Amino acid sequence: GSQVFEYAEVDEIVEKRGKGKDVEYLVRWKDGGDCEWVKGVHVAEDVAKDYEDGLEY
C-alpha cells in the first residue's frame, strides 16, 4: 500500500491525516522526506480526506 495514482500534485495536496481534532491537506508541492501541509479546514479537510484516505490508505 502506498501512493495510488501518480501523486505528483506539486501544488494540489498529496497527503493528509492528523489528530482527532487536527488534520490537513497539503503534502505535494515541496515536501520530500515528510509532510508539510498547514491546515485541512482551510485546505478542505473534509474534502481531501476522501481523496487520499481511500487512495494511499
Side-chain angles (χ1 to χ4, degrees):
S2 67
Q3 299 179 301
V4 175
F5 208 47
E6 286 180 60
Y7 242 153
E9 340 306 289
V10 70
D11 172 298
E12 310 181 0
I13 55 177
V14 126
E15 237 182 300
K16 67 103 170 182
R17 308 182 62 280
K19 309 177 181 179
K21 300 183 302 179
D22 184 0
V23 191
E24 1 173 357
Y25 306 69
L26 269 209
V27 186
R28 19 72 250 173
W29 53 170
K30 295 179 181 179
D31 60 60
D34 303 359
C35 307
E36 352 276 58
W37 32 201
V38 187
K39 281 96 64 58
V41 60
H42 148 71
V43 188
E45 175 188 300
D46 184 60
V47 179
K49 62 159 50 181
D50 175 60
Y51 177 99
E52 175 270 69
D53 194 60
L55 293 179
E56 179 170 60
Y57 181 45

